[PDB]
Every structure is written in structure tokens, then in C-alpha cells.
A paper describes a structure:
Receptor tyrosine kinases exhibit a variety of activation mechanisms despite highly homologous catalytic domains. Here, we show that the juxtamembrane (JM) segment enhances RET catalytic domain activity through Y687. Structure-function analyses identified interactions between the JM hinge, αC helix, and an unconventional activation-loop serine phosphorylation site that engages the HRD motif and promotes phospho-tyrosine conformational accessibility and regulatory spine assembly. We demonstrate that this phospho-S909 arises from an intrinsic RET dual-specificity kinase activity and show that an equivalent serine is required for RET signaling in Drosophila.
Both crystal structures contained the PP1 tyrosine kinase inhibitor in the nucleotide-binding pocket, had an ordered proximal portion of the RET JM segment, and had a hyper-phosphorylated status with four sites phosphorylated (Y809, Y905, S909, and Y928). The structures differ slightly in resolution and in the occupancy of the phospho-S909 site. In the crystal structures presented in this study, phospho-S909 displaces phospho-Y905 and adopts an approximate equivalent position by engaging activation segment residues R897 and R912, as well as R873 from the HRD motif instead. The second unexpected phosphorylation site at Y928 is positioned beneath the tethered phospho-S909 and is likely to further disrupt interactions of phospho-Y905 with the activation loop. The JM-KD structure revealed contacts from a short segment of the proximal JM region (residues D707 to W717) with a hydrophobic patch composed of residues from different structural elements including β4 (L790), β5 (L800, L801, L802), and αC helix (L769, L772, L773, F776, L779).
Author numbering:
A (entry chain A), B (entry chain A): 710 to 819, 845 to 1011
Write the structure that this text describes.
């Protein structure tokens, strides 16, 4: 029983699904083509996300949660929602198509200069600054949760775990322990507290992933040992393809006090100062 | 911070990990060899389960939950726990090794006669009757959660979501919506009620998977539409490789009233009557 919003409902007969682009804990995403989308004559190459054959109740809640947050945002660096098919069969979410795939895969498949990586971090920081202005916390901010559309333009994705900056619900059942530990902020890891400043912590780990072309954060460190490491003040070390100014930004994102961490508005200007220089 | 039980702690220096056997929502399972296990001189081919590099707090809780339930059971058709490495690094669970892999994959890879399939259902019903005697509900009973060791002997696995038949804890934080809908009992789907009779419902779906050699239950039916179908009394249809007596057993497992469903003790005798005849 899903409410069908007419502003986003799309006819299933006007949608042809193609080959599977990926399947896992996120769901089932297939490539597809949608004709007469948004009233524009012709067809459009899109991406359709659906539940798996072995989906659980929580898997639907995330797809509906992802559906809600995508109806409310709009940004050239946040994946765009085009339509949905909530009636007469399976639930399909029709969104923008990212040719080059997820960012974690795109970085691993690599020729990219250091200017290309700072551009990626700049785009992600731009969209995140917008989400902060939209009163949203992403929580699940990582390299795997970022898409790469055509033009190598970064697109923020996976809003199934996102919450409001101001809780606008009388009773919200709390999701528990669904954020990977190595991307969790120390206060989120210690008291289940997720904020925009916690996304900055997650963004700092994202910077580490980009400068390493899809590296595994805290290498060889069991995630069950990371709480003790972060509680004592230990962070990650300087990687190989990192400058003195770039590594300083990661540590500012990893400051213990969330007030001592920069906001995404400052991160965008800090990263542009690296692009110009 | 994990408590190290000396009855199950095993030295990491006495364990060599090999190639990865599988990775996903369940965790990371690698093939390995353990020397001087259980005091027996020599080495033993085992399987080691560990957390992923992007594991979340709940992923650890399941591994610890799976660890607890495996310390307490023993059956030739339930996977056997051999040891663990909870100190000085990553958390490793050392259990029995299943050469032929998961049951869902083993059925799909297939020459098997109808007698071979009833034998598999018999073995799974035997171990489940034992778990019911051990006051345990498995909940996540499916074909993917069953292993096939050497000799094509069935081994019940994945106890991360298992609960006690009698709740022996003052405050237990409830996991929510982690069982795939198509395997959920109608009362579990309607009021979050998981019991041994609900495992019989799940076992009936497992029978359907075996007689179809790893088929997808309720084919072409969106899992969001299954609650309405089961609430109106509709079940699955007779498959192709199913007898009149075998299909009757599935429907008895799918009876609305859980008291109207058979117990695993009767299922073992019902399946043996098919093996003899
Ligand atoms: C709502 C929604 C829908 C689809 C996706 C998505 N996942 N993925 C994979 C997982 C294949 C990289 C994609 N690859 C390309 N384009 C996409 N749009 C996606 C993400 C969110
Ligand atoms: C505690 C525990 C440890 C390992 C496994 C396990 N998963 N898997 C896959 C997923 C590769 C089929 C296995 N394949 C063979 N043998 C095994 N033992 C396993 C299950 C539970």
C-alpha cells in the first residue's frame, strides 16, 4: 500500500527496462528507456531502481525513504528523480542515469590528474552544501554512494538512510547500526548522533577515498578497533597522492568537536582555492 | 570490546586464510586451514567468516548473534562452530567448511533425482526439529541460508537473526524488517510474530525452492503485493516436479492458523514416507 503522487507517477507501458546495472544491499538497478518523460516528446535513457526478489520490509522502507527525499531536492550534483511506477505491479523508481557508474568503481577502474580529483570533491561539496541548506543529513556519505553521470559529473545518491535536520515527525522508528563504522563520525559512533557536521566527518573520509582512487579507509584496521582509535585521538595518516593543504582539510573534517569542523560552504571555497592554484 | 570465551578461542598464528568463498550482506567468508584444532594433531580445512571493510554496527551484532547461537547447538545438519579469534585484531569465526556451497547455488548449478531432493528436505527438517527442541526460532529459513558440505549433506547456517523460543533477556533491542517478505509467515508479516510454527511456514517455501532447483518463490509477484495475496488465502501453485503428496505438505506449512501447521517432528516422518515409497 503505497501512496501514488500524481506529480511523479509514470506509466509503466511507457517504460522499457533493459540490462541489470547492479544488484546488492542497495536493491536492483537496471538500465532503461522512458518515452514521453516530463511531457517532452521522444525517449530518454534513464535508470530504474526496484526491490529484489528477496526484499525485506526494511528494504522497502529505504526505497520509500529514498523516494521521499528525491521528490524534494534538485541539484546538478544530486541525482535527479524523474518518475515512479507505484500502481499495477512492482514499485519502480525512475531517476537520472549515470553512465560511468559509482564513484568507488570509477576511481578503481582508472587516467586522472590531481585536478580531476579536486573537481570531484568540489562537486560533492557543492551538492552537500545544498543538502545542508535543504535541512538534510545524508549519513551514508561515502565513495560507493556517489554516482558518475556523463561528463564525469558527480551525483550524490542513496538517500535511504538520510534524515531531516529538524525531525518533523511525531514518532519515527529509529534505524540502528546501518552506517559503516569507518565512515561514522565519532559522536555518531559514541552516542548515535548524526548531524551536518557528522557528514563533514564522513566527507573527510570521502576525500581520503578519492585521493587514493577508491582506497579502503583505515587499511588493515578491524572496524571493531576503530572506536578505540578515534577515542584516543588517532586519525588516518597522510596518503601518497596528497598535498600538505589537502591532508589538512581531512583532519579539519575529523576534529573531535563538531563545531570545530568546517561547513560545506567553507569546503567548497577551500577546494576551489586548490583548483585555481 | 568482545568477550573472549576460552572454550572457543583459537590462536590466529595457527590459522592460515585462503581465497574468498563469498561476500555480501552476510559478511566475508574465506576458505582457510586451521592446525591443531580441538587438540587434534595436524591441520583441518575450515571456513572463516569475518566482517567486511565497510561493516556497520548491526553487521557486528549479527556476527556476535551468530556466534552465540553456534556455541550452543550441535547437529550433523547444523553447521558446526570450531573456534574464534576475538583478540589481537579482527574478529574471525572458524566453522565447518561446506565444499559444495550454498543450497540455492547447488540446486541452480545442476544431475539430481527426486529422491535426492526429498533427502535434502529430510535433513533440513531433522536439524530444524532439533533447533525447535533447543528452543530456537530461525526466522531466516531459506535455500540461500543452507549450506552443502561434502557428501551433499545439508547444513543449516546463518543464525544472525535467530531468536530464543523463550525470551531470556530483560531488554532486547528488536531487529526490524530483515526477513525477506516471500519467506515471512503471514502472522510475522502481519504482527511481527516469529515462532517455530512460523519457521514451518518458511520451511514450506524452502520445499518449493528445492523442488524447483533454486526457484524464485512467487515468480513475477512483487513482494509488496504478497501481503494482500496471503491475507486473501492465496498461496503458491503446484510446480512442475511436485507430487500430489509433496505439494500437500507445502500447503499444510502455509495454513493460516499456526496451530494448524505441522511440527518439524511430523515433517521428518512425512518426508521419510516419501523416501521409502
Ligand atoms: C534511486 C536510485 C536509482 C538508481 C541508482 C543507481 N545505482 N547504480 C549502481 C548501483 C548500478 C551504481 C547506478 N548506476 C547508474 N545510474 C544510476 N541511477 C544508478 C541509485 C539510486
Ligand atoms: C558462521 C558462518 C561461517 C561461514 C559461513 C559460510 N558462508 N558460505 C558462503 C556464503 C560462501 C556460501 C560458505 N561456504 C562454505 N562453507 C561455509 N562455512 C560458508 C556461514 C556461517
Amino acid at each position: 500500500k503505497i501512496l501514488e503522487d500524481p506529480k511523479w507517477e509514470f506509466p509503466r507501458k511507457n517504460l522499457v527496462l533493459g540490462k541489470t546495472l547492479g544488484e546488492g544491499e542497495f536493491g536492483k538497478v537496471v538500465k532503461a528507456t522512458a518515452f514521453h518523460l516530463k511531457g517532452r516528446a521522444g525517449y530518454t535513457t534513464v535508470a530504474v531502481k526496484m526491490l529484489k526478489e528477496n526484499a525485506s520490509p526494511s528494504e522497502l522502507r529505504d526505497l520509500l525513504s529514498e523516494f521521499n527525499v528525491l521528490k524534494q531536492v534538485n541539484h546538478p550534483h544530486v541525482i535527479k528523480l524523474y518518475g515512479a511506477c507505484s500502481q499495477d505491479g512492482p514499485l519502480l523508481l525512475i531517476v537520472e542515469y549515470a553512465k560511468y557508474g559509482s564513484l568507488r568503481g570509477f576511481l578503481r577502474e582508472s587516467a586522472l590528474t590531481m585536478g580531476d580529483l579536486i573537481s570531484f570533491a568540489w562537486q560533492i561539496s557543492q551538492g552537500m552544501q545544498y543538502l545542508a541548506e535543504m535541512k538534510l543529513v545524508h549519513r551514508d556519505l561515502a565513495a560507493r554512494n556517489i554516482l558518475v553521470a556523463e561528463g564525469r559529473k558527480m551525483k550524490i545518491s542513496d538517500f535511504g538512510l538520510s534524515r531531516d535536520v529538524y525531525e518533523e515527525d511525531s514518532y519515527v522508528k529509529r534505524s540502528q547500526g546501518r552506517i559503516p563504522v569507518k565512515w561514522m563520525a565519532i559522536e555518531s559512533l559514541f552516542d548515535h548522533i548524526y548531524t551536518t557536521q557528522s557528514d563533514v566527518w564522513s566527507f573527510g573520509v570521502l576525500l581520503w577515498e578519492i585521493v587514493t582512487l577508491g582506497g579502503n579507509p583505515y587499511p588493515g584496521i578491524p572496524p571493531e578497533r576503530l572506536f578505540n582509535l578515534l577515542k584516543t585521538g588517532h586519525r588516518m595518516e597522510r596518503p601518497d597522492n596528497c598535498s600538505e593543504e589537502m591532508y589538512r582539510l581531512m583532519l579539519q573534517c575529523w576534529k573531535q568537536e563538531p563545531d570545530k569542523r568546517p561547513v560545506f560552504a567553507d569546503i567548497s571555497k577551500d577546494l576551489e582555492k586548490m583548483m585555481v592554484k
